Design a protein around this ligand. Structure first.
Ligand SMILES: [Zn+2]
Length: 609
DNA sequence: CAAGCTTTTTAAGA
DNA sequence: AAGGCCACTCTTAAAAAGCTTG
RNA sequence: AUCCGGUAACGAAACUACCGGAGACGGGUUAGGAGGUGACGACCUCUAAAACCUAGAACUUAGAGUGCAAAUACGAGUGUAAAAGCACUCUAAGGAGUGGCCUU
């Protein structure tokens, strides 16, 4: 793709006349999608328990756009089947709507009322992306995580039968690879004979019921197995968060959310005065007609049509008058090899606090359509990634680590947890959220169990949504974006300064080799003149300043800097098994004590040299 | 009771 | 609660329900 | 209550201790720096900040500039006369997010 974003704050971009609508739209969109996703998930379970396994001439259920859209209509209180016209295929849609509506009645333990969920926002286009994004989540989850279900039912079966844990993984690993070329898998789909991996991409819906079946077995069938080995997966994703999610607003979405006939006529009057061309727009329905109908003639180029959207954005928003216009007015960054010129793409993603402007190359702007020797001179460093010590970088004589605690302090994790708990406690949800919803597992695939979670939440949905609608939760989301870059960038500057100057001490370290000693003395004045040797495994934001290379990680944690043999082992003989403390097993060592980061980082640098 | 107009929302579109 | 991966980045003609006029 | 660095123990660890700095999301209010006599301290004034309250702004990394806050000695013994930190501009280096899932 050729799309980039400029994430900033939403203040001032939307006029005060429409700021209330945008924030309310975000709340409404989250409520509709969050409830609709649960209804869709429950509806799928209804089908699974009522029609799985299928008959010889029955089709495996495939979710589409209209399934989720109907769920949104049901959540909004719509009882009339939202189907256009009468026909064979349209008849199927009407029947599907009735099935979902009946399930909605069963899901909640009281009679639905129409005038308890009514809304006055035209979120039809805004909700479309959440429908597509949710639908894509189902496909992504099936394709990228189905193998995990395969490697878990077999593992649980082996454990349930008393076999050793080590052998269970052996059987599961071999079985999964073999099936790439026993009832957990569907019949081979591709008639061309390609491996099963191609079939998974060809049709994800066929494999979706298989995951649901596996989850049911984990909850009840494998009772004897320890719970730690039966962590439930989520075959059917749904929006479980209560903090409002970011909505996507396009030219069509913005056009119908913040316009009326009185305002629409103003746009025509303003457009006529500035451009002198009358627009063939009669009402809010014909507003989004094609360029040919609006002007009566085809645009000279796609750019001309795109510019029409930009002008409409200007009338509805402060795109050309707000602070953020500095970064959107054809800004060309200094060091782009191609000299790309970036301009607003007529698309914005926002949640009422943070705003994400879409910016694309000027050449491609318009309406869219459906579809080696540097090692000698550079200074070399070794790096060993992790998850507690995120990065451990050493020059062979000294080491610096980017500990997870450093990022937490930079991102103010303790305060964010402190503030979030206080708001939850203040609203009285602490005695309910931690006590009730924690027991009923939301991942449960049993309709009875999942229904209990759904209705239990519904009794406190109003309180829960309002508590998390506070801007503090969304403001923290921007802080982590802001401070996370600061923490990483700040460490990058430290990396240069530490190794920028020749080492002033060369005696305290003993085991350093001659080649490594020479490297440490090099003087470097630029970020790009330092090469860091990374492992096979944050690096994306390090390559912008520091050149990088890959070093094998084979036995890096066992080999000793002092010896060709792996004489290192975890510390022993002390009251507590200290986490990363390492000690040699023999006296033939220039150094006895070692740390995992120092020892691991040293080996990576040594292999590079 | 008849007709015009507006506005959500559908639905195809590779 | 936090780090990694995968997918996506949507435009337009119209059906039908609701409202106004006498 | 957390991060970095150093001291010892033949490159040292969230129960080994000691030594020196950092910092506390955005807004209301506390205690600390600075000034009538660039004396002390009594009061007054600029600044600023956590306990508590709160629907709430902000792309990031190093530096360089500008601009701060105002009212002891004579005489024919005795009177009286720049710091913490805040904001703006630069150079040069970066500069795509949303949603779901997995894992701990
Ligand atoms: Zn050794």
């Amino acid at each position: 793709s050729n799309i980039r974003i400029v994430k900033r704050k939403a203040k001032g971009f939307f006029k005060c006349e429409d700021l209330v609508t945008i924030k309310d739209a975000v709340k409404a969109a989250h409520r509709i999608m969050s409830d609709a996703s649960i209804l869709v998930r429950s509806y799928y379970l209804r089908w699974f328990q009522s029609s799985y396994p299928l008959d010889s001439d029955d089709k495996e259920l495939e979710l589409e756009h209209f399934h989720i859209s109907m769920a949104c209509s049901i959540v909004q209180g719509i009882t009339r089947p939202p189907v256009r016209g009468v026909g064979p295929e349209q008849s199927v849609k009407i029947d599907v709507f009735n099935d979902m509506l009946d399930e909605y009645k069963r899901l909640y333990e009281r009679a639905p009322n129409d005038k308890e969920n009514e809304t006055d926002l035209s979120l039809s286009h805004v909700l479309a992306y959440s429908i597509d994004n949710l639908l894509t989540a189902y496909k992504n989850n099936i394709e990228a995580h189905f193998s995990k279900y395969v490697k878990r039912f077999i593992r649980c079966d082996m454990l349930a039968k008393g076999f050793n844990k080590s052998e269970a993984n052996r059987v599961a690993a071999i079985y999964t690879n073999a099936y790439i070329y026993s009832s957990l898998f569907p019949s081979k789909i591709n008639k061309g004979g390609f491996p099963r991996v191609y079939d998974l991409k060809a049709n994800p819906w066929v494999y979706l019921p298989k995951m649901v079946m596996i989850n049911q077995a984990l909850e009840t069938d494998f009772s004897s197995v320890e719970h730690k080995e039966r962590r439930l997966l989520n075959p059917l994703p749904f929006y479980s968060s209560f903090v409002p999610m970011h909505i996507r607003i396009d030219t069509s979405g913005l056009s119908q959310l913040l316009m009326t006939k009185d305002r629409l006529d103003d746009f025509k009057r303003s457009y006529l005065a500035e451009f002198g061309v009358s627009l063939n727009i009669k009402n809010k329905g014909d507003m989004l007609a094609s360029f040919e109908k609006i002007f009566g003639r085809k645009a000279t180029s796609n750019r001309e049509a795109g510019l029409y959207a930009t002008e409409m954005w200007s009338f509805l928003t402060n795109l050309k008058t707000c602070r953020q216009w500095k970064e959107l007015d054809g800004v060309v960054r200094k060091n782009d090899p191609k000299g790309t010129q970036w301009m607003f793409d007529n698309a914005v993603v926002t949640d009422g606090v943070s705003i994400s402007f879409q910016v694309i190359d000027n050449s491609m702007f318009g309406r869219k359509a459906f579809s080696r020797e540097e090692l000698k001179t550079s200074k070399l460093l070794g790096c060993d990634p992790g998850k507690r010590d995120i990065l451990a970088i050493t020059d062979g004589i000294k080491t610096i680590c980017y500990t997870k605690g450093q990022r937490d302090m930079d991102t103010h994790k303790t305060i964010r947890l402190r503030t979030s708990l206080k708001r939850r406690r203040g609203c009285g949800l602490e005695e309910y959220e931690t006590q009730v919803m924690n027991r009923f597992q939301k991942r449960s695939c049993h309709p009875e169990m999942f229904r209990r979670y759904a209705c239990s939440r519904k009794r406190m949905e109003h309180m829960l949504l309002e508590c998390y609608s506070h801007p503090v939760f969304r403001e923290f989301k921007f802080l982590v974006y802001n401070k996370t870059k600061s923490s990483e960038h700040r460490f990058m500057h430290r990396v240069l300064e530490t190794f920028k100057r020749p080492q002033t001490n060369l005696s305290k370290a003993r085991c350093a080799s001659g080649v490594m000693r020479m490297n440490a003395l090099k003087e470097v004045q630029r970020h790009g003149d330092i090469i860091i040797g990374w492992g096979n495994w944050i690096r994306r934001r390090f390559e912008s300043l520091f050149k990088t290379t890959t070093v094998p990680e084979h036995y890096t944690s066992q080999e000793c800097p002092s010896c060709k043999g792996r004489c290192l082992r975890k510390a022993t003989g002390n009251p507590i098994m200290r986490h990363h403390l390492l000690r040699c097993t023999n006296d033939s060592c220039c150094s006895r004590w070692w740390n995992r980061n120092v020892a691991g980082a040293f080996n990576i640098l040594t292999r590079l040299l």
